[PDB]
Design a protein around this ligand. Structure first.
Ligand code: HEM
Ligand SMILES: CC1=CCC[C@]2(C)CCC3=C(C)CC[C@H](C[C@@H]12)C3(C)C
Length: 424
């Protein structure tokens, strides 16, 4: 297909339930909220997660994404020990500290900056500290470059031959796995030496995890999970953080309301008092602007599933071994579900999204395959906007007619969103 070229390629020639051939598999795209409910609500019952083989070889077969059945449930339980709302509140300080440092170091004293490069650095560095407690900038830059190489092979042709992108990506995964295996060895030692806590980061959470039978996670499962996690954490959270101020510039009224919400929160805090989980909950309108950005520019257009049994959706029957694709482009860009879909209206998510119809806004999927790091991303997006507004009274886009594009899946500012900075 050509996502980087066009999106929303529908076929009035067929019903919302239209069959097609995708990645050499008969795939029926179930367009519409009901098709979304069918695919996302019936997991391990009528359908099962199916990733293309190319991705299976890049992130491994021992991740929560590549595992199905009880194992996937166990792997999600271990991850809930870090991404669960209760635990996630224990990492706000480190995340807030990094975002504040990044803004003060690379943004505060700059007349003009390119957002994309800075957002990618902050997003990855936050993962390096929360996943492996790695603060060494050079080590962070090393692993950042290694992930960039492996990410190039995910969209390239799956040719495992010398001098090919997919081949070099597989070489990067082997290197990253060796580095991560070393981190696992050192962490186990630090834990026995009392040099590391069991909740300081995701590595300790995964190592410290035991099944109801008391069986621990294997090193390969920890490596594959960390790889699948690094893939779902970088180019995803980067899309909204780089596009939020681009859309807020085209809708200054919305930016005004965000600044009003942020400065009000600060007016109720002492000097030196750090942002709190309660402060984050007070950023309701800021979160509505983020959801409006995700609706208009979904970092993930949709995912595929495998028919684990014959399916009788509507009148047509989806036989076992068939593929099923759902798309945010069946509801997000539809006036039927979102009035004036081309218009940026954070008001669409007023009252905590109490007016959003079911299976219409699915930026983080739904069911048992829903995003594991959605609130982790929301925390970063809110803390990022907070520190920006706290530091800058205003900002001016260098090219207000800058376009949005993807190479090929992550929608991002076509030129990095260069902006003039006006420090408070
Ligand atoms: C640190 C950041 C993130 C992490 C660690 C993360 C991790 C994950 C994990 C573990 C899953 C479940 C995979 C499975 O078991 O099948 C998932 C699903 C998903 N994530 Fe993320 N994610 C992150 C950020 C994002 C962002 C920013 C978006 C969108 C803007 C996103 C969109 C999704 C979607 C749509 C799904 C479900 C896809 C489907 O099954 O239909 N994620 N993510
Ligand atoms: C959501 C999800 C969580 C981690 C596992 C997945 C399968 C890795 C492959 C991918 C990413 C690099 C980021 C996002 C989706 C899916 C990923 C696509 C296919 C682009």
């Amino acid at each position: 297909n050509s996502l980087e070229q066009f999106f929303d390629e529908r076929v009035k020639k067929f019903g919302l339930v239209f069959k097609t051939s995708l990645i050499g598999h008969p795939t029926v795209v179930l367009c519409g909220p009901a098709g979304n409910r069918l695919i996302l609500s019936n997991e391990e019952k009528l359908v099962q997660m199916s990733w293309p083989a190319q991705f299976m070889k890049l992130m491994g077969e021992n991740s929560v994404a590549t595992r199905r059945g009880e194992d996937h449930i166990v792997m999600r339980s271990a991850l809930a020990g870090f991404f669960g709302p209760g635990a996630l509140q224990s990492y706000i300080g480190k995340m807030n500290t990094e975002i504040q440092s990044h803004i003060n170091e690379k943004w505060k004293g700059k007349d003009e900056v390119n957002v994309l490069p800075l957002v990618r650095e902050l997003v990855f560095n936050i993962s390096a500290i929360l996943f492996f407690n790695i603060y060494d900038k050079q080590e962070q830059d090393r692993l950042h470059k290694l992930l960039e190489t492996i990410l190039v092979g995910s969209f390239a042709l799956p040719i495992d031959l010398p001098g090919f992108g997919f081949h070099r990506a597989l070489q990067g995964r082997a290197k990253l796995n060796k580095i991560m295996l070393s981190l696992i060895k050192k962490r186990k030692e630090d834990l026995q030496s009392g040099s590391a806590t069991a909740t300081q980061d995701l590595l300790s959470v995964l190592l410290t995890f035991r099944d109801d039978k008391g069986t621990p996670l294997t090193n390969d499962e920890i490596l594959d999970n960390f790889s699948s996690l690094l893939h779902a954490s970088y180019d995803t959270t980067t899309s909204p953080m780089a596009l939020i101020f681009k859309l807020l510039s085209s809708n200054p009224e919305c930016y005004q309301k965000v600044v009003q919400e942020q400065l009000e929160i600060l007016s109720n805090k002492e000097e030196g008092e750090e942002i709190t989980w309660k402060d984050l909950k007070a950023m309701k309108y800021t979160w509505q602007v983020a959801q409006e950005t995700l609706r208009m520019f979904p970092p993930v257009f949709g995912t595929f599933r495998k028919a684990i049994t014959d399916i009788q959706y509507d009148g047509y029957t989806i036989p076992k071994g068939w593929k099923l694709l759902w798309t945010t482009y069946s509801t997000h860009p539809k006036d039927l579900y979102f009035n004036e879909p081309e218009k940026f209206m954070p008001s669409r998510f007023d009252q905590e999204g109490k007016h959003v119809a079911p299976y219409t806004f699915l930026p983080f999927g739904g069911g048992q395959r829903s995003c594991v790091g959605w609130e982790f991303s929301k925390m970063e997006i809110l803390l990022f906007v907070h520190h920006f507004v706290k530091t800058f009274s205003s900002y001016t886009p260098v090219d207000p007619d800058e376009k949005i594009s993807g190479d090929p899946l992550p929608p991002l500012p076509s030129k990095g969103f260069s902006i003039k900075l006006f420090p408070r």
